[PDB]
Amino acid sequence: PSFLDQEPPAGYVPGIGRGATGFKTLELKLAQKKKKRANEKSNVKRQFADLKESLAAVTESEWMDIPDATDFTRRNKRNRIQEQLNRKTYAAPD
Amino acid sequence: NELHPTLPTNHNKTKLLKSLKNTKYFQQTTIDWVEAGLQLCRQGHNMLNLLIHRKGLTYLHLDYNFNLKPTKTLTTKERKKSRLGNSFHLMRELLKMMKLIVDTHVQFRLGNVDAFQLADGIHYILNHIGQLTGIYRYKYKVMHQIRACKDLKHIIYYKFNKNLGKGPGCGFWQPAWRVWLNFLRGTIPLLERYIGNLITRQFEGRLDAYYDLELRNSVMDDILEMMPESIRQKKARTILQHLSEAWRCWKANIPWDVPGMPAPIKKIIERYIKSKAD
Amino acid sequence: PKAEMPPEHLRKIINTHSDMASKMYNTDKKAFLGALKYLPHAILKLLENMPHPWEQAKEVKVLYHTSGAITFVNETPRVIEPVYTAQWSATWIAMRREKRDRTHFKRMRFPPFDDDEPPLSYEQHIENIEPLDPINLPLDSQDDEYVKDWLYDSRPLEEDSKKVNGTSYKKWSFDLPEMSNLYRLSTPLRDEVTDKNYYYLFDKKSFFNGKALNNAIPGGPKFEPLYPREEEEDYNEFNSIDRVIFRVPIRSEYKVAF
Amino acid sequence: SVLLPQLRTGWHVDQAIVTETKRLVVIRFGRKNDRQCMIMDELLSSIAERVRNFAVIYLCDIDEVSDFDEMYELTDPMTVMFFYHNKHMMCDFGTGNNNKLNFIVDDKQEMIDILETIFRGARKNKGLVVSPYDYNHKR
RNA sequence: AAAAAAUUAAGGUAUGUAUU
RNA sequence: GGAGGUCAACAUCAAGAACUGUGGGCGCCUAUAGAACUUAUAACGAACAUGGUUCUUGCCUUUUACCAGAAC
């Protein structure tokens, strides 16, 4: 992802460079009308948010020394065995 | 109608036409109703053509009766381009109806018709709009109005065409007129929005599926919110993995207890799991 | 503030406007873009303001765009209810007589103009042409004297001070003879069983009940059930046929009534 | 979601399409808040690793870069658009628009087939491919 | 002199090279 | 000053008894806001159209079309 890093264009339009192919009074009045209507006319975060404040306390050393990649079902081993078992087939005898 | 009435309070709005008039662009005067009608037909004709023009559909044309025709038999690729939305067609057909009515008054004014024939005609027009325009192809709903008009036809003719009683004459049109006037009242704004949106684009160009994914997003944010931003990204990825593993562990009845974890983090994830499980 | 101007100005604009026509006036965001969207609204005013079968013509007030973008019709029809009723009944009378008069009543072909045929100008083609008289009725002059003098105007009564609110035309009141003429003329159109008693099972309440209970009157409209479940049909001592005594239909009308 | 990177300028979009010679370049065009642009952002993120050898994925937001709205014509919450050697690829899902992708695909597996189909057909210069499963009914 | 209508639309784009 | 203004702007808009808060005037009176109950939803409009959501009927399990009931 080297480009991702760099950050600078030439003062260049995107479509052209690649070689791209594609396959005020009334307004004011409208706005006013809309307004005449606006005038006339979450939970999860709440549940948690309260915990998130609780976190604030934790030190930066602890943030580092956090165990990283623990698997408890041995999912990888079972999955591989399953693929091996299901690989090929065989033809049934005559 | 009686069973489910509505009742509105709208202090908020002062008329489109009262408001529209104010400022430099607009002017007011008087005019022959027929003359105005003629103007309206031309206006609509031009505007629809403008839309078509903007869309690049140069192989289609409207006639003066608002029928959309092909100028050249088109290829299926071109047919796909031509596929034009219902809303447009509703407008077009609407104009077609309007035109038809206006034209009969024009011909009466010419003195080529007859006041009696005229009345009979406009009566006929309203009764048979489903045949004369075919608008229903673009709203099927409108059938209600059509059917109502049909019923009115049946009743009224029984009342004056059962004496003396065979062909035309008739000329009563109040009832049917009312039906269409109300119908229009109910559709105006839909068309206004469609047209308006179209034009501005001309100048611009719980549930299972939902919940679980939101749940993660909320949790990661707050945890990614607290991360000291020397180490945020790295610290995070493994933060994601624990949630996935803890939820696996919940499924399988494995307990999911871990060596070194701060208690505050360990709280949050358990809370999340309790929520996800439910 | 908001002055009214001569119709000739408007005519001048549209004479100029035709030339601009269609695709060539592509630019105009401020006039053309704004004007068109409410154009559909404009149709409603015009149709509602249809001239009526006893009028020769209707002149109306309009708001037009300076660009020639659009015309809205300003007026709202305010009618006097008894008068309007009488007027429509008048024409009803006329229609019957006219039908009696002759066998070969010509109905219009419809699509009045050819697909390719362009618009005839109102200003030249139409303005000269003349009205050609409309419907009306041969009311007896003696009987309808008070009524006849004004009966077929755009305002059923001009701008009397005693008769009317005034120019604005909200609020109205008549003398007894005026009412009696109006009433008598309107009689063919309005005939009802005036007593509340005729509508024993035809009022709103009874219909509401018939709907709610899924038991329409023979005359009456019928809806879907409203209440879904008719499933329970449980035989039981209270209910049992040996126990019950049987006479009489128990017609649906009884259910609505009681 | 934090797995998959994002493209913050239209100039990041264009270089990213060019520099990847050997693999698809798959882009989701749509905006973070959307209901349906979050769902796809998942079904891709799970798949992105499996496929790293023939397909590369990125994320773009209509609001962040609106430069590309008119040329490719972008409507609705999100559009999945496949590129190989600067050539916009194209597939018929039975949905009636052969350009891009709209609807939300359901399984991980049926998504990997489509990527794999597009790549394989694409490698041969073929401009149309056929999605094995045709979700015209779905969308 | 025995009898015709009351149903509508999108899911239909061949690649590929060459020329403009 | 008066009527009329098919002229506009700005507020409100069923009625009634009773509770609470604020402001004004000399415990009382008046105005405004909120809640509860009644009338019959006697009608702000003797008029009545469209759309969204959620449910329940028919569906190609598709629409920028619908069928006909419900509530918001």
PDB file of N, CA and C in Angstrom, chain C residues 25-97:
ATOM      1  N   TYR C  25     -33.733  27.634 -24.801  1.00  0.00           N
ATOM      2  CA  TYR C  25     -33.756  28.154 -23.410  1.00  0.00           C
ATOM      3  C   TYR C  25     -33.356  27.082 -22.366  1.00  0.00           C
ATOM      4  N   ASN C  26     -32.151  26.539 -22.534  1.00  0.00           N
ATOM      5  CA  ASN C  26     -31.597  25.559 -21.603  1.00  0.00           C
ATOM      6  C   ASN C  26     -31.058  26.212 -20.337  1.00  0.00           C
ATOM      7  N   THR C  27     -30.424  27.380 -20.470  1.00  0.00           N
ATOM      8  CA  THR C  27     -29.769  28.050 -19.326  1.00  0.00           C
ATOM      9  C   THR C  27     -30.667  28.218 -18.051  1.00  0.00           C
ATOM     10  N   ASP C  28     -31.495  29.268 -17.998  1.00  0.00           N
ATOM     11  CA  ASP C  28     -32.457  29.608 -16.917  1.00  0.00           C
ATOM     12  C   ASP C  28     -32.734  28.751 -15.637  1.00  0.00           C
ATOM     13  N   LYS C  29     -31.729  28.634 -14.780  1.00  0.00           N
ATOM     14  CA  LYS C  29     -31.899  27.998 -13.484  1.00  0.00           C
ATOM     15  C   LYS C  29     -32.864  28.803 -12.619  1.00  0.00           C
ATOM     16  N   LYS C  30     -32.757  30.131 -12.644  1.00  0.00           N
ATOM     17  CA  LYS C  30     -33.543  30.956 -11.708  1.00  0.00           C
ATOM     18  C   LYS C  30     -35.021  31.042 -12.084  1.00  0.00           C
ATOM     19  N   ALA C  31     -35.345  31.075 -13.376  1.00  0.00           N
ATOM     20  CA  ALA C  31     -36.757  31.138 -13.785  1.00  0.00           C
ATOM     21  C   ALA C  31     -37.318  29.764 -14.191  1.00  0.00           C
ATOM     22  N   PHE C  32     -36.659  29.144 -15.164  1.00  0.00           N
ATOM     23  CA  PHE C  32     -37.211  27.929 -15.756  1.00  0.00           C
ATOM     24  C   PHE C  32     -37.233  26.809 -14.722  1.00  0.00           C
ATOM     25  N   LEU C  33     -36.145  26.635 -13.984  1.00  0.00           N
ATOM     26  CA  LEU C  33     -36.095  25.535 -13.033  1.00  0.00           C
ATOM     27  C   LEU C  33     -37.143  25.686 -11.936  1.00  0.00           C
ATOM     28  N   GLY C  34     -37.254  26.888 -11.381  1.00  0.00           N
ATOM     29  CA  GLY C  34     -38.235  27.154 -10.345  1.00  0.00           C
ATOM     30  C   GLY C  34     -39.680  27.081 -10.796  1.00  0.00           C
ATOM     31  N   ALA C  35     -39.946  27.654 -11.962  1.00  0.00           N
ATOM     32  CA  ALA C  35     -41.310  27.813 -12.445  1.00  0.00           C
ATOM     33  C   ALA C  35     -42.050  26.513 -12.724  1.00  0.00           C
ATOM     34  N   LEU C  36     -41.354  25.573 -13.355  1.00  0.00           N
ATOM     35  CA  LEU C  36     -41.942  24.317 -13.820  1.00  0.00           C
ATOM     36  C   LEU C  36     -42.490  23.381 -12.739  1.00  0.00           C
ATOM     37  N   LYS C  37     -41.784  23.267 -11.617  1.00  0.00           N
ATOM     38  CA  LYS C  37     -42.097  22.237 -10.630  1.00  0.00           C
ATOM     39  C   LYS C  37     -43.500  22.364 -10.034  1.00  0.00           C
ATOM     40  N   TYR C  38     -43.900  23.610  -9.834  1.00  0.00           N
ATOM     41  CA  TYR C  38     -45.213  23.968  -9.333  1.00  0.00           C
ATOM     42  C   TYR C  38     -46.197  24.077 -10.494  1.00  0.00           C
ATOM     43  N   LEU C  39     -45.707  23.790 -11.695  1.00  0.00           N
ATOM     44  CA  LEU C  39     -46.528  23.832 -12.890  1.00  0.00           C
ATOM     45  C   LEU C  39     -47.661  22.835 -12.730  1.00  0.00           C
ATOM     46  N   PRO C  40     -47.312  21.620 -12.112  1.00  0.00           N
ATOM     47  CA  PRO C  40     -48.455  20.695 -11.991  1.00  0.00           C
ATOM     48  C   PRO C  40     -49.565  21.300 -11.137  1.00  0.00           C
ATOM     49  N   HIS C  41     -49.220  21.963 -10.037  1.00  0.00           N
ATOM     50  CA  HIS C  41     -50.219  22.699  -9.267  1.00  0.00           C
ATOM     51  C   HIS C  41     -51.095  23.584 -10.152  1.00  0.00           C
ATOM     52  N   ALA C  42     -50.486  24.191 -11.164  1.00  0.00           N
ATOM     53  CA  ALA C  42     -51.178  25.143 -12.024  1.00  0.00           C
ATOM     54  C   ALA C  42     -52.351  24.475 -12.716  1.00  0.00           C
ATOM     55  N   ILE C  43     -52.192  23.211 -13.076  1.00  0.00           N
ATOM     56  CA  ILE C  43     -53.259  22.490 -13.749  1.00  0.00           C
ATOM     57  C   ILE C  43     -54.497  22.426 -12.870  1.00  0.00           C
ATOM     58  N   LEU C  44     -54.310  22.238 -11.572  1.00  0.00           N
ATOM     59  CA  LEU C  44     -55.457  22.073 -10.690  1.00  0.00           C
ATOM     60  C   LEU C  44     -56.353  23.298 -10.669  1.00  0.00           C
ATOM     61  N   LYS C  45     -55.761  24.482 -10.637  1.00  0.00           N
ATOM     62  CA  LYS C  45     -56.565  25.693 -10.608  1.00  0.00           C
ATOM     63  C   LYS C  45     -57.396  25.834 -11.875  1.00  0.00           C
ATOM     64  N   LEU C  46     -56.784  25.565 -13.021  1.00  0.00           N
ATOM     65  CA  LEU C  46     -57.483  25.708 -14.290  1.00  0.00           C
ATOM     66  C   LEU C  46     -58.654  24.742 -14.485  1.00  0.00           C
ATOM     67  N   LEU C  47     -58.461  23.466 -14.170  1.00  0.00           N
ATOM     68  CA  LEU C  47     -59.533  22.490 -14.340  1.00  0.00           C
ATOM     69  C   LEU C  47     -60.688  22.777 -13.407  1.00  0.00           C
ATOM     70  N   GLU C  48     -60.356  23.143 -12.180  1.00  0.00           N
ATOM     71  CA  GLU C  48     -61.365  23.433 -11.184  1.00  0.00           C
ATOM     72  C   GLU C  48     -62.161  24.617 -11.686  1.00  0.00           C
ATOM     73  N   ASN C  49     -61.465  25.543 -12.333  1.00  0.00           N
ATOM     74  CA  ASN C  49     -62.118  26.761 -12.806  1.00  0.00           C
ATOM     75  C   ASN C  49     -62.777  26.580 -14.178  1.00  0.00           C
ATOM     76  N   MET C  50     -63.150  25.351 -14.548  1.00  0.00           N
ATOM     77  CA  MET C  50     -63.838  25.147 -15.820  1.00  0.00           C
ATOM     78  C   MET C  50     -65.070  26.012 -15.854  1.00  0.00           C
ATOM     79  N   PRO C  51     -65.341  26.586 -17.018  1.00  0.00           N
ATOM     80  CA  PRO C  51     -66.310  27.657 -17.228  1.00  0.00           C
ATOM     81  C   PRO C  51     -67.788  27.346 -16.967  1.00  0.00           C
ATOM     82  N   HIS C  52     -68.188  26.072 -16.942  1.00  0.00           N
ATOM     83  CA  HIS C  52     -69.598  25.672 -16.702  1.00  0.00           C
ATOM     84  C   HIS C  52     -70.445  25.812 -17.955  1.00  0.00           C
ATOM     85  N   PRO C  53     -71.425  24.907 -18.150  1.00  0.00           N
ATOM     86  CA  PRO C  53     -72.201  24.790 -19.380  1.00  0.00           C
ATOM     87  C   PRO C  53     -73.153  25.963 -19.708  1.00  0.00           C
ATOM     88  N   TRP C  54     -73.468  26.829 -18.754  1.00  0.00           N
ATOM     89  CA  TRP C  54     -74.315  27.987 -19.068  1.00  0.00           C
ATOM     90  C   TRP C  54     -73.490  29.263 -19.300  1.00  0.00           C
ATOM     91  N   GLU C  55     -72.179  29.204 -19.107  1.00  0.00           N
ATOM     92  CA  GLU C  55     -71.366  30.379 -19.344  1.00  0.00           C
ATOM     93  C   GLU C  55     -70.929  30.373 -20.809  1.00  0.00           C
ATOM     94  N   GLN C  56     -70.776  31.560 -21.396  1.00  0.00           N
ATOM     95  CA  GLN C  56     -70.193  31.694 -22.742  1.00  0.00           C
ATOM     96  C   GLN C  56     -68.685  31.582 -22.590  1.00  0.00           C
ATOM     97  N   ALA C  57     -68.156  32.216 -21.551  1.00  0.00           N
ATOM     98  CA  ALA C  57     -66.731  32.302 -21.366  1.00  0.00           C
ATOM     99  C   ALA C  57     -66.438  32.694 -19.943  1.00  0.00           C
ATOM    100  N   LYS C  58     -65.221  32.402 -19.508  1.00  0.00           N
ATOM    101  CA  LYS C  58     -64.767  32.746 -18.177  1.00  0.00           C
ATOM    102  C   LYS C  58     -63.441  33.473 -18.312  1.00  0.00           C
ATOM    103  N   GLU C  59     -63.389  34.688 -17.795  1.00  0.00           N
ATOM    104  CA  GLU C  59     -62.127  35.386 -17.710  1.00  0.00           C
ATOM    105  C   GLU C  59     -61.607  35.212 -16.293  1.00  0.00           C
ATOM    106  N   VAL C  60     -60.334  34.877 -16.177  1.00  0.00           N
ATOM    107  CA  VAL C  60     -59.752  34.507 -14.904  1.00  0.00           C
ATOM    108  C   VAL C  60     -58.466  35.262 -14.680  1.00  0.00           C
ATOM    109  N   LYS C  61     -58.049  35.295 -13.429  1.00  0.00           N
ATOM    110  CA  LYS C  61     -56.847  36.012 -13.083  1.00  0.00           C
ATOM    111  C   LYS C  61     -55.729  35.037 -13.057  1.00  0.00           C
ATOM    112  N   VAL C  62     -54.604  35.432 -13.629  1.00  0.00           N
ATOM    113  CA  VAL C  62     -53.492  34.517 -13.685  1.00  0.00           C
ATOM    114  C   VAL C  62     -52.197  35.141 -13.283  1.00  0.00           C
ATOM    115  N   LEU C  63     -51.328  34.273 -12.796  1.00  0.00           N
ATOM    116  CA  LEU C  63     -49.985  34.658 -12.476  1.00  0.00           C
ATOM    117  C   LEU C  63     -49.079  34.050 -13.550  1.00  0.00           C
ATOM    118  N   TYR C  64     -48.290  34.866 -14.221  1.00  0.00           N
ATOM    119  CA  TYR C  64     -47.463  34.294 -15.253  1.00  0.00           C
ATOM    120  C   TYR C  64     -46.005  34.602 -14.989  1.00  0.00           C
ATOM    121  N   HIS C  65     -45.143  33.736 -15.496  1.00  0.00           N
ATOM    122  CA  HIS C  65     -43.725  33.922 -15.318  1.00  0.00           C
ATOM    123  C   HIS C  65     -43.192  34.925 -16.343  1.00  0.00           C
ATOM    124  N   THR C  66     -42.284  35.810 -15.929  1.00  0.00           N
ATOM    125  CA  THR C  66     -41.748  36.860 -16.818  1.00  0.00           C
ATOM    126  C   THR C  66     -40.979  36.267 -17.996  1.00  0.00           C
ATOM    127  N   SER C  67     -40.429  35.076 -17.790  1.00  0.00           N
ATOM    128  CA  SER C  67     -39.694  34.341 -18.806  1.00  0.00           C
ATOM    129  C   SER C  67     -40.611  33.698 -19.817  1.00  0.00           C
ATOM    130  N   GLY C  68     -41.893  33.615 -19.487  1.00  0.00           N
ATOM    131  CA  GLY C  68     -42.854  32.886 -20.296  1.00  0.00           C
ATOM    132  C   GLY C  68     -42.841  31.418 -19.888  1.00  0.00           C
ATOM    133  N   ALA C  69     -42.232  31.108 -18.735  1.00  0.00           N
ATOM    134  CA  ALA C  69     -42.153  29.718 -18.225  1.00  0.00           C
ATOM    135  C   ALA C  69     -43.503  29.071 -17.890  1.00  0.00           C
ATOM    136  N   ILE C  70     -44.421  29.804 -17.272  1.00  0.00           N
ATOM    137  CA  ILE C  70     -45.636  29.149 -16.808  1.00  0.00           C
ATOM    138  C   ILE C  70     -46.781  30.091 -16.448  1.00  0.00           C
ATOM    139  N   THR C  71     -47.995  29.557 -16.521  1.00  0.00           N
ATOM    140  CA  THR C  71     -49.188  30.295 -16.144  1.00  0.00           C
ATOM    141  C   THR C  71     -49.930  29.583 -15.029  1.00  0.00           C
ATOM    142  N   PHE C  72     -50.191  30.269 -13.912  1.00  0.00           N
ATOM    143  CA  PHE C  72     -51.054  29.728 -12.852  1.00  0.00           C
ATOM    144  C   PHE C  72     -52.380  30.460 -12.838  1.00  0.00           C
ATOM    145  N   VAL C  73     -53.496  29.769 -12.633  1.00  0.00           N
ATOM    146  CA  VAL C  73     -54.772  30.495 -12.564  1.00  0.00           C
ATOM    147  C   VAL C  73     -55.142  30.883 -11.132  1.00  0.00           C
ATOM    148  N   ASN C  74     -55.217  32.189 -10.886  1.00  0.00           N
ATOM    149  CA  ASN C  74     -55.419  32.750  -9.545  1.00  0.00           C
ATOM    150  C   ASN C  74     -56.735  32.501  -8.796  1.00  0.00           C
ATOM    151  N   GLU C  75     -57.856  32.585  -9.502  1.00  0.00           N
ATOM    152  CA  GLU C  75     -59.173  32.571  -8.864  1.00  0.00           C
ATOM    153  C   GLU C  75     -59.583  31.233  -8.258  1.00  0.00           C
ATOM    154  N   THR C  76     -60.387  31.298  -7.202  1.00  0.00           N
ATOM    155  CA  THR C  76     -61.001  30.120  -6.595  1.00  0.00           C
ATOM    156  C   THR C  76     -62.509  30.280  -6.705  1.00  0.00           C
ATOM    157  N   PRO C  77     -63.220  29.259  -7.172  1.00  0.00           N
ATOM    158  CA  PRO C  77     -64.657  29.466  -7.379  1.00  0.00           C
ATOM    159  C   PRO C  77     -65.442  29.484  -6.065  1.00  0.00           C
ATOM    160  N   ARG C  78     -66.031  30.623  -5.733  1.00  0.00           N
ATOM    161  CA  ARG C  78     -66.893  30.678  -4.573  1.00  0.00           C
ATOM    162  C   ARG C  78     -68.313  30.695  -5.100  1.00  0.00           C
ATOM    163  N   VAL C  79     -69.074  29.665  -4.758  1.00  0.00           N
ATOM    164  CA  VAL C  79     -70.475  29.598  -5.192  1.00  0.00           C
ATOM    165  C   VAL C  79     -71.503  29.675  -4.042  1.00  0.00           C
ATOM    166  N   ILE C  80     -72.717  30.072  -4.393  1.00  0.00           N
ATOM    167  CA  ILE C  80     -73.812  30.058  -3.458  1.00  0.00           C
ATOM    168  C   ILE C  80     -74.481  28.740  -3.664  1.00  0.00           C
ATOM    169  N   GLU C  81     -74.587  27.969  -2.589  1.00  0.00           N
ATOM    170  CA  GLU C  81     -75.004  26.576  -2.679  1.00  0.00           C
ATOM    171  C   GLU C  81     -76.404  26.293  -3.274  1.00  0.00           C
ATOM    172  N   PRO C  82     -77.478  26.944  -2.754  1.00  0.00           N
ATOM    173  CA  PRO C  82     -78.838  26.798  -3.299  1.00  0.00           C
ATOM    174  C   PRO C  82     -78.930  27.279  -4.752  1.00  0.00           C
ATOM    175  N   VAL C  83     -78.169  28.323  -5.058  1.00  0.00           N
ATOM    176  CA  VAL C  83     -78.191  28.919  -6.373  1.00  0.00           C
ATOM    177  C   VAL C  83     -77.546  27.990  -7.371  1.00  0.00           C
ATOM    178  N   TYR C  84     -76.357  27.512  -7.012  1.00  0.00           N
ATOM    179  CA  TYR C  84     -75.581  26.572  -7.825  1.00  0.00           C
ATOM    180  C   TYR C  84     -76.405  25.325  -8.112  1.00  0.00           C
ATOM    181  N   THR C  85     -77.074  24.816  -7.063  1.00  0.00           N
ATOM    182  CA  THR C  85     -77.939  23.651  -7.188  1.00  0.00           C
ATOM    183  C   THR C  85     -79.026  23.894  -8.238  1.00  0.00           C
ATOM    184  N   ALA C  86     -79.645  25.059  -8.105  1.00  0.00           N
ATOM    185  CA  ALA C  86     -80.747  25.430  -9.006  1.00  0.00           C
ATOM    186  C   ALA C  86     -80.229  25.537 -10.428  1.00  0.00           C
ATOM    187  N   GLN C  87     -79.049  26.138 -10.586  1.00  0.00           N
ATOM    188  CA  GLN C  87     -78.452  26.327 -11.910  1.00  0.00           C
ATOM    189  C   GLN C  87     -78.211  24.972 -12.557  1.00  0.00           C
ATOM    190  N   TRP C  88     -77.680  24.032 -11.778  1.00  0.00           N
ATOM    191  CA  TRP C  88     -77.378  22.752 -12.390  1.00  0.00           C
ATOM    192  C   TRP C  88     -78.675  22.028 -12.790  1.00  0.00           C
ATOM    193  N   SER C  89     -79.723  22.177 -11.960  1.00  0.00           N
ATOM    194  CA  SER C  89     -80.985  21.523 -12.208  1.00  0.00           C
ATOM    195  C   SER C  89     -81.602  22.088 -13.449  1.00  0.00           C
ATOM    196  N   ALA C  90     -81.417  23.400 -13.664  1.00  0.00           N
ATOM    197  CA  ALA C  90     -81.912  24.108 -14.837  1.00  0.00           C
ATOM    198  C   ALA C  90     -81.392  23.421 -16.106  1.00  0.00           C
ATOM    199  N   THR C  91     -80.093  23.202 -16.099  1.00  0.00           N
ATOM    200  CA  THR C  91     -79.468  22.603 -17.273  1.00  0.00           C
ATOM    201  C   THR C  91     -79.921  21.164 -17.445  1.00  0.00           C
ATOM    202  N   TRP C  92     -80.175  20.447 -16.342  1.00  0.00           N
ATOM    203  CA  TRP C  92     -80.723  19.108 -16.375  1.00  0.00           C
ATOM    204  C   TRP C  92     -82.040  19.086 -17.158  1.00  0.00           C
ATOM    205  N   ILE C  93     -82.895  20.071 -16.892  1.00  0.00           N
ATOM    206  CA  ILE C  93     -84.172  20.203 -17.564  1.00  0.00           C
ATOM    207  C   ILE C  93     -83.969  20.322 -19.087  1.00  0.00           C
ATOM    208  N   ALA C  94     -83.057  21.235 -19.406  1.00  0.00           N
ATOM    209  CA  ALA C  94     -82.750  21.588 -20.787  1.00  0.00           C
ATOM    210  C   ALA C  94     -82.277  20.364 -21.559  1.00  0.00           C
ATOM    211  N   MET C  95     -81.414  19.574 -20.908  1.00  0.00           N
ATOM    212  CA  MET C  95     -80.822  18.397 -21.519  1.00  0.00           C
ATOM    213  C   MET C  95     -81.917  17.424 -21.938  1.00  0.00           C
ATOM    214  N   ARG C  96     -82.896  17.223 -21.065  1.00  0.00           N
ATOM    215  CA  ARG C  96     -83.944  16.264 -21.368  1.00  0.00           C
ATOM    216  C   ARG C  96     -84.750  16.724 -22.595  1.00  0.00           C
ATOM    217  N   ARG C  97     -85.053  18.023 -22.598  1.00  0.00           N
ATOM    218  CA  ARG C  97     -85.863  18.586 -23.683  1.00  0.00           C
ATOM    219  C   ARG C  97     -85.127  18.465 -25.001  1.00  0.00           C
TER     220      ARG C  97
END
